[model samples]
Target: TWRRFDVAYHDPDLDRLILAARPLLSESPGRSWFQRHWVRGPHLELWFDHPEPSWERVREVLGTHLRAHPSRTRIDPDRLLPQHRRLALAEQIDEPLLPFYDDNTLHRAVPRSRVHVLGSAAAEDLFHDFHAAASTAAFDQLDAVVAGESRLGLAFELMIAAAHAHAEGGITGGFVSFRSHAEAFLAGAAGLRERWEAEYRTRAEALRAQVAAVVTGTPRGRAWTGLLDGFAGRGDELIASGALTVEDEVLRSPSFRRYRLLLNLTFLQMSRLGVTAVQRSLLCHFAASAVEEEYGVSAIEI
Candidate 1:
């Protein structure tokens, strides 16, 4: 039952010490899990996965990296235990802890990763091609994930009766649409959630056919074909599991919540489509389209 032991270093010097010795990550589980999550060097999360590194070797590497000042090292294993069934809810599933693209990519995109293995040349080219187009997408708040009291009040009451008090007080774009029957919208929050759930499901067939239509349209599409094969007929459910998340009790979750892997696979294919049309990036976001459709209803329901 040996698994990855991720160590998050606090010191940049020590961080580099670990990073510099990555030994070139092969096609590993963690890499596949996150598709080679590119992050900042100072916050490198090195893993000692399968073919497990020796404890002495680990000590040599970590201690050698720690050198003289090891006091700064911090391990946030608070997840292992923080008390449960104690009337406490878990962390809202929607929020994104990963930094947005604007932040420094402390995450190194190791070579031989899937994107590299399947379509390296095409990945980068398509990545940039869609960069400009996708840049038009929304800038959602990572901190929008919030917790609420176990109340089923107006539910609409969840909306702060004021302005961006969250700046002093939270969430985004003031809905001028509310100028007309806002509570009606709130009352139907759960309904809207179900509706989009249905819609994405409906679109799942079309979405699958859409990808199949372009399997060999370009290098990227061909490479992504198999990666997406299993997901083709099931994009809706997979996307929803990562997208629509709100129980009978909740207010909001992360602003730009999603099924990271599914969404990423989608973006990859979409980008390739744009490339097929001689564009690297497309000016569309599947998740954003769903978000725009569902609005924030699922998160607001009691």
Candidate 2:
């Protein structure tokens, strides 16, 4: 696993030199910017309990390292962003090589101090936007109600929530980046995708049966389970996955033991996770996405 420690070199050998230098160094009291998260290697990659220390402190670390070994500093313009380009010459934020924090674009969508100017037009705008916005049910803060046509604001909220663990009792927000970091993340989320697939299908079946029981009757024929006797056929086999099992009751029960939010919010989550708008939804994956197509209200999957 790797992280953004207070060092700047991705090269482990170079980083060794910096680590040796750490004891004598004096800069932002505590921060680490030297390491990259992945070469896309490792079975699991999780960030440590890292709250960012000051970025200015990070700047100082970069500046000091370059200054002490002025000739040793090598810039990778191909790696540095165009906006961050001038900082190289300006003697401020020293650019770490390529992947150049491949995460900064990702970070703007990360969390920060949001100036929430409390308001009524904001209220009416949001109220109309999603109805529950500014409500007692927790559309109260903009942070609380982050999905847009309210737009970029919602993008931040989804990514923030998507950043946590995805299974039950794990946080459900940040499911966007979280899924990327999952199974991929070493610490907590192992076998997550496999578990989710089987479990979701299991729960989906239960919910299907619950709803089917309402209109459908128990099959009259007796049958050995997953077994086929010549006289007794597969009488009660379910023909369809119940897409209309719109019951939130299962969601309310902790005893349910299923992480129901993914089923519930996947449409909302995926909607924001991707860049372009989703024009069609086929949720057995929870209506996977929804929008318009060139032909109008529908999209092609067949």
Candidate 3:
């Protein structure tokens, strides 16, 4: 993927020169622009599906802008030609490019130019929704399983593990072992219902509340207060139930902590990528549906 492009200007007037060039380059070109401004520095970024022919378009735009805004624009191109050439080379090589993947299987990979531009955005949105929906539904089903529902069997456990893995590492691994264990646990005479009711319920509740807070945008103070209340009430009740001593082991499990951290990080990354709130919510729904389909569950709690 194209990571970034940086350009430095000795004269501040170059910033205006670049801004003025934006409309000319981006106008009807099927490209998008995202710019960031800083006190110590300023830059303009133009994101395109494919590379432009050369800096000729940029030069033409700059020349026109300079001619029209002679007073605001400064630094003659003749004086900065060498620097511009170098900057063009660097920017061309490191433009903010995005990766393109073929279908859900990811067997084929191509540049954004090869695919339709809007299609790329739609594909990314779909994947985001898919993962989010799967995770949300899994969490909900887990809550029901913990609530003495007994509907979710070993397959549900595997689905949860798979969701965890997908959240952590982008759906490449981590579910195979979980699936095997889930099948064995379900087929055999395991104390599945009692084990879930006594052990996993409280943990699932806590995690569900966390996710709900994120989705609902509940104030941090309110979320923490709610968490404390839940812990004091249900958490305390579960702990006092005497199902097993050293229940803290569940909280201390590396996988559990890893799962929570991964969930938080995934949310942060998605937000940083400029994912809309509506899209995020849709993805959460999709994730939940996936879990329901795989586990024969009705609805997830959180």
Candidate 4:
């Protein structure tokens, strides 16, 4: 499996040089801007984007430059065409060179190297547009919630809870558990809850530790310590009064886990600019509403 993914170009210089050459070569009506001397090494390899470069014109440019700087650059012309062919083949399987928006507008799909080459001002403008749009949308959502609208609140809350669950445990063990249970239910399993509890018991400890570290300012101990503390505080009613059965406890435990996972996932997605700011604010609003409804108390109390 490892061999399926080859790690070529260990040298940073080679990587930089290749990245620099990519845009120059991929541009319309391609041109050769590569300099072998630019990369300081004994064994140099030159790869072209296309197999058949106008060789006569290329030789003239290269010959003049070589005469000006007499050094043993060791040009491997034999592999040039073959490497080009390999690149062409790779392109067939490779993703697009740029990130195209769904609307098909080329609004910042340029490679990082190309962006850097254009200098700081140009790059700043490109990123600024994306950020500004996202920020504006987020504030608009917050404004809507403040005005007492609840269109997006529920979705936002679910996303937050899902995120928390995913980061606390693995994604497969998080919200996807619903899908897993559905399959098990279809298989005529009577002890599905028992199986789920057994599986979760082994996994929840690790997940709790993971979540605790993120939520609390603690390290070197279990992450779920704070959550466990809260649950334990309710232990008197749970055990002494026999108010909550074991099954009820098990169900409630997963609900807490789901909430944590969703919260974490929402933040993680937001970090990547995966969801708009308006979406996040709406989520927060809905989550608050849900909590208020469940506890039949003021949202501020929670």
- Best by the TM-score measure: 1
Provide C-alpha RMSD values for all models, in order: 18.7, 21.1, 21.6, 22.3
Candidate 3 clash total?
8
**C-alpha positional error of residue 119 in candidate 2 after TM-score superposition, expressed in Å:** 20
The candidate scoring highest on lDDT is 3
- Candidates sorted by TM-score, best first: 1, 3, 4, 2
Candidate 4: lDDT of 114? 22
TM-scores for every candidate against the unseen true structure: 0.26, 0.18, 0.23, 0.21
The runs of at least 3 residues in candidate 4 whose Cα sits more than 4 Å from the true structure, single-residue gaps closed, are 1-103, 107-154, 163-275, 297-299
Give model 4's TM-score versus the native structure: 0.21
**Candidate 4 clash figure, as a count:** 27
Q: Give the residue spans of candidate 3 off by over 4 A.
A: 1-252, 298-302
Model 4 agreement with the true structure over 39-143: per-residue lDDT tens digits: 111112222334333344334444453344334234443445455445435433232322111210111111112233323443333333333332333333334
Residue 275 in model 1: lDDT: 19
lDDT of candidate 3 over 1-302, digit per residue (tens): 31122222323323354445445444543333332221112232333333562345545665565456543223344544555456546434332222211111101112223123213443333333333333333334334444554332322222233344333332222223233333333455356534533444444544344333333343432322232222223222322443212212445544443343333333332332223333333334333434333434443221
lDDT score, residue 183, model 1?
36
Better of 1 and 2 by TM-score: 1
Q: Report the error of model 1 at residue 253, Å.
A: 22
How far off is residue 295 in model 2, in Å? 38
Give the Cα lDDT of each candidate.
0.29, 0.27, 0.34, 0.33
Better of 1 and 3 by TM-score: 1
